[PDB]
């Protein structure tokens, strides 16, 4: 018979390590703008003269 055998508690330490790749590299430099409109309209100038 062991005295404090089955009454031992286990405690996880404070060492969470995130081990995935999540990163917005290209989204982090696109110079974000807000737009509260339905669609994005601009003019494209071809030739013709």
């Amino acid at each position: 018979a062991k005295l404090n055998l089955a009454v031992l508690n286990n405690v996880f330490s404070e060492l969470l390590t995130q081990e995935i790749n999540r990163s917005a590299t290209f989204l982090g430099l696109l110079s974000k703008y807000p737009e509260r409109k339905s669609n994005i309209q601009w003019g494209v100038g071809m030739g013709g003269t």
């Binding site: 005295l3 089955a6 009454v7």
Partner: protein, 50 residues
């Protein structure tokens, strides 16, 4: 244990004490109730019931 040996004996066998767990789970179920009363009943029960 505590057994009896001679005075010039040879130190009897080993024995310690013991403990045990209990673990007593709680977290599955609940005791609940609903009653689903209307919004028009709470006006025609202030001038209906004495």
């Amino acid at each position: 244990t505590a057994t009896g040996v001679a005075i010039t004996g040879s130190a009897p066998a080993a024995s310690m004490d013991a403990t045990l767990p209990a673990q007593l789970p709680i977290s599955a179920a609940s005791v609940q109730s609903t009653f689903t009363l209307n919004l028009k009943e709470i006006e025609e029960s202030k001038e209906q019931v004495t």
